Design a protein around this ligand. Structure first.
Ligand SMILES: COc1ccccc1[C@@H](OC)C(=O)N1CCC[C@H](C(N)=O)C1
Ligand SMILES: [Zn+2]
Length: 139
């Protein structure tokens, strides 16, 4: 679990969004595993606007942060799960690192701010849904 809070928006994994997230829906994209809902309280986070390929992410299944080198956002095949059919997930960045069910929502950050959130795992890999292209989150 986990979310990004920026301005009057909350960014979560689409497959973990709550009834309240859906009742206050701003935008969602099943192909990216993202959903953004509106909030009344002002958010605590700032979004990176950069091309960094190194950063640090929080891994809840280890209660630790790990440094990673990750690929540029791209279209990557993801195996079927209880949440999605087998499909290509877009705007996804892969890295070598630990991730298991329960780790989705952990934040990936670089020196400029929030880059994205954990969205895929297994096989000693961790995949992050990029949010750096969502410029409207900042206004
Ligand atoms: C049960 O899923 C897993 C199985 C083995 C290892 C890892 C997972 C789980 O790692 C977080 C994962 O990758 N996904 C489940 C949730 C939806 C994710 C997606 N389609 O963006 C895919
Ligand atoms: Zn950066």
């Amino acid at each position: 679990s986990g979310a990004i809070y920026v301005g009057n928006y909350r960014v979560v994994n689409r497959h973990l969004a709550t009834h309240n997230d859906w009742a206050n829906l701003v935008w969602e994209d099943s192909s990216r595993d993202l959903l953004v809902s509106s909030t009344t309280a002002q958010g605590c986070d700032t979004i990176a606007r950069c091309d960094c390929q190194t950063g640090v992410y929080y891994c809840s299944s280890r209660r630790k942060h790990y440094p990673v080198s990750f690929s540029k956002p791209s279209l990557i095949f993801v195996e079927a799960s209880e949440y999605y059919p087998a499909r290509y997930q877009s705007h996804l960045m892969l890295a070598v690192g630990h991730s298991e069910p329960g780790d989705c929502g952990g934040i990936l950050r670089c020196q400029h701010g929030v880059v994205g959130i954990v969205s895929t795992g297994g096989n000693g890999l961790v995949g992050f849904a990029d949010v750096r292209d969502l410029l409207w989150l900042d206004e």
